[PDB]
């Protein structure tokens, strides 16, 4: 008994086509957003939380 | 049609500690009384199941550990070939249950932990099913309300760790109406 | 947002990003001067715009010299012609408890309760709820007379930088120190205090009614607030907090 996990799109083919950089205030250096595993991050869209 | 390596009382009934080979391949290793299992014994099945626990008159009574063939596991107090009392059940997805049993089913104040999420379900059970006023304890919040069929059914409340509550009711099977008030804690 | 300082208030630069076009801005200066003329108001604040579904609901409020009365609010569709809304009560605001969602366009849209519910009464009662719950006043802007008439503080400085981050230095702009503080809030933490451009701006963004924006700088004289948002109450707030 073990659930299956959909693996990451490690290339730039699917949802990871564009790389994302996040900075809080301009002037501060940008922080690279990591790549997205589908079944752990996007399937858990039933959460709804503040940033 | 089998063998038994132990002592037998005056007629030939099975008494005391002994190892018996049942005709299909099952094996019992434990105490005997008057040709019936009575005491702490290890009953083994040929499929893969195994019961280590107490017996009263060829029936599981008292505390006993059961290994189930699908991968489940139960240690708890038994009564007359049925789970009856304080018992702990574990399932195939490592979900555990800790609560009362009446007749081979969850009945009474039971605590269910969903190990795939870590959330808890502490509340009443009717006929092995989520029924009654309960507490669906998640990580940062908990639902104090009524359950009927694996789902909230009527009015309830959501207690949060931020120091507030959310009153509401379930007008549908899976839909919650958040009206009207929010209280302080 | 005051009518005499609409261009003197950083609306798009407040960080909410829900401001006005130059068309809507020039329409607000001319039309709020008009509703300062024909409606005898002591001062007129631009309350905000409701986005709607098929048209935008621009809302402005006017105040008398008593400064604590219920506001004679006004509405517009093309942001040019403004007319008075009826006064609100609790029994009329109770009527939309069986309906939810955004509201669109003309005030003559009938909603199903079957009692037909007008768009206009839902709009003005929702305006009353956003006025009662959120759109805070800053500390020191409203001083107290022995009589019931409250005057706006001409000598208002009124918030030091050590008291900018605190919840207790903001009161609710609602007749009830003077008023109810922001620490009497449910849930705890329903306001986003955020530092833009250093000490030259602070925003008290409401999370119970987004996207309400409270408008500083300190050392000022603005002392303003603006609600642009979807229009309904955020009942989802303790889950996301």
Swiss-Prot record, chain A:
Subcellular location: Cytoplasm, Cytoskeleton, Cilium axoneme
Protein purpose: Functions as part of axonemal radial spoke complexes that play an important role in ciliary motility. Essential for triplet radial spokes (RS1, RS2 and RS3) head assembly in the motile cilia.
Tissue specificity as recorded in UniProt: Expressed in the trachea, ependymal cells and oviduct (at protein level). Abesent from sperm (at protein level). Expressed in brain, kidney and testis.
Phenotype when the gene is knocked out: Mice show hydrocephalus and the tracheal and ependymal cell cilia show clockwise rotation motion instead of planar beating. All three types of radial spoke heads (RS1, RS2 and RS3) are missing in the tracheal cilia.
Full-sequence range covered: 411 to 461 of 716
Subunit-structure text: Component of the axonemal radial spoke 1 (RS1) and 2 (RS2) complexes, at least composed of spoke head proteins RSPH1, RSPH3, RSPH9 and the cilia-specific component RSPH4A or sperm-specific component RSPH6A, spoke stalk proteins RSPH14, DNAJB13, DYDC1, ROPN1L and NME5, and the RS1 complex-specific anchor protein IQUB. Interacts with RSPH1. Interacts with RSPH3B. Interacts with RSPH6A. Interacts with RSPH9.
Protein name listed in UniProt: Radial spoke head protein 4 homolog A
Protein family membership: Belongs to the flagellar radial spoke RSP4/6 family.
UniProtKB/Swiss-Prot annotation, chain B:
Subcellular localization(s) per the UniProt record: Cytoplasm; Chromosome; Cytoplasm, Cytoskeleton, Cilium axoneme; Cytoplasm, Cytoskeleton, Flagellum axoneme
Keyword line: Cell projection, Chromosome, Cilium, Cytoplasm, Cytoskeleton, Flagellum, Meiosis, Repeat
GO BP: any one term: epithelial cilium movement involved in extracellular fluid movement
Residue stretches spanning the membrane: none
Entry keyword Cytoplasm: yes
UniProt function note: Functions as part of axonemal radial spoke complexes that play an important part in the motility of sperm and cilia.
Protein name as catalogued: Radial spoke head 1 homolog
Source species of the chain: Mus musculus
Gene, per the UniProt record: Rsph1
Swiss-Prot record, chain C:
The keyword Cytoplasm is assigned to this record: yes
Phenotype caused by lack of the gene: RNAi-mediated depletion in the ependymal cilia results in a near complete central pair apparatus loss and alters the ciliary beat pattern from planar to rotational. Multiple radial spokes proteins, including those in the head, are markedly down-regulated in the cilia.
Gene this protein is translated from: Rsph9
Any one Gene Ontology cellular component term annotated for this protein: radial spoke
Official protein name in the record: Radial spoke head protein 9 homolog
Key words, A-Z: Cell projection, Cilium, Cilium biogenesis/degradation, Cytoplasm, Cytoskeleton, Flagellum
Location within or outside the cell: Cytoplasm, Cytoskeleton, Cilium axoneme; Cytoplasm, Cytoskeleton, Flagellum axoneme; Cell projection, Kinocilium
Function recorded in the entry: Functions as part of axonemal radial spoke complexes that play an important part in the motility of sperm and cilia. Essential for both the radial spoke head assembly and the central pair microtubule stability in ependymal motile cilia. Required for motility of olfactory and neural cilia and for the structural integrity of ciliary axonemes in both 9+0 and 9+2 motile cilia.
């Amino acid at each position: 008994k073990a659930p299956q996990v959909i693996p990451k799109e490690e290339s730039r083919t699917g949802a990871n086509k564009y790389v994302y950089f996040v900075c809080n205030v301009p002037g501060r250096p940008w922080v690279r957003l990591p790549s997205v595993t589908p079944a752990q991050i996007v399937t858990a869209r039933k959460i709804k939380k503040f940033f | 049609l089998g063998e038994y390596e132990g002592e037998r009382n005056e007629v030939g009934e099975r008494h005391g500690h002994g190892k018996a080979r049942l005709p299909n391949g099952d094996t019992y290793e434990g105490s005997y009384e008057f040709g019936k299992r009575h005491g702490q014994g290890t009953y083994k099945f040929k499929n893969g199941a195994r019961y280590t626990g107490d017996y009263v008159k060829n029936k599981k009574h008292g505390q006993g550990t059961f290994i189930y063939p699908d991968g489940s596991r139960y240690e708890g107090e038994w009564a007359d070939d049925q789970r009856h009392g304080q018992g702990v059940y574990y399932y195939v997805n490592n979900d555990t249950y800790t609560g009362e049993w009446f007749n081979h089913q969850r009945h009474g104040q039971g605590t269910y932990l969903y190990a795939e999420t870590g959330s808890k379900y502490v509340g009443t059970w009717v006929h092995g099913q989520q029924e009654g006023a309960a507490e669906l304890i998640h990580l940062n919040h908990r639902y104090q309300g009524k359950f009927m069929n694996k789902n909230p059914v009527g009015p309830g409340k959501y207690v949060f760790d931020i120091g507030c509550e959310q009153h509401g009711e379930y007008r549908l099977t899976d839909t919650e109406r958040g009206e009207e008030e929010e209280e302080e804690e | 947002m005051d009518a005499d300082s609409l261009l003197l208030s950083l609306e798009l630069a407040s960080g909410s990003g829900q401001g006005l076009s130059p068309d809507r801005r020039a329409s607000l200066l001319t039309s709020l001067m008009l509703v300062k003329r024909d409606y005898r108001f002591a001062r007129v604040l631009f309350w905000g715009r409701i986005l709607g579904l098929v048209a935008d609901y621009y809302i402005a409020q006017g105040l008398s010299e008593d400064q604590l009365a219920p506001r004679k609010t006004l509405y517009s569709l093309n942001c040019t012609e403004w007319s008075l809304l009826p006064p609100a009560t609790e029994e009329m605001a109770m009527q939309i408890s069986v309906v939810s969602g955004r509201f669109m366009g003309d005030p003559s849209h009938e909603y199903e309760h079957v009692v037909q519910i007008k768009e206009e009464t839902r709009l003005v009662s929702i305006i009353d709820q956003i006025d009662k719950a959120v759109a805070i006043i800053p500390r020191g802007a409203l001083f107290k007379t022995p009589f019931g008439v409250t005057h706006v503080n001409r000598t208002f400085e009124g918030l030091p930088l050590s008291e900018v981050r605190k919840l207790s230095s903001y009161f609710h702009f609602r007749e009830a120190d003077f008023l109810d503080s922001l620490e009497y809030d449910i849930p705890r933490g329903s306001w986003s205090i955020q530092m833009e451009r250093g000490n030259a701006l602070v925003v008290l963004r409401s999370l119970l009614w987004p996207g309400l924006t409270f408008y500083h700088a300190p050392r000022t004289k603005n002392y303003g607030y603006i609600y642009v948002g979807t229009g309904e109450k955020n009942m989802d707030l303790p889950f996301m907090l």
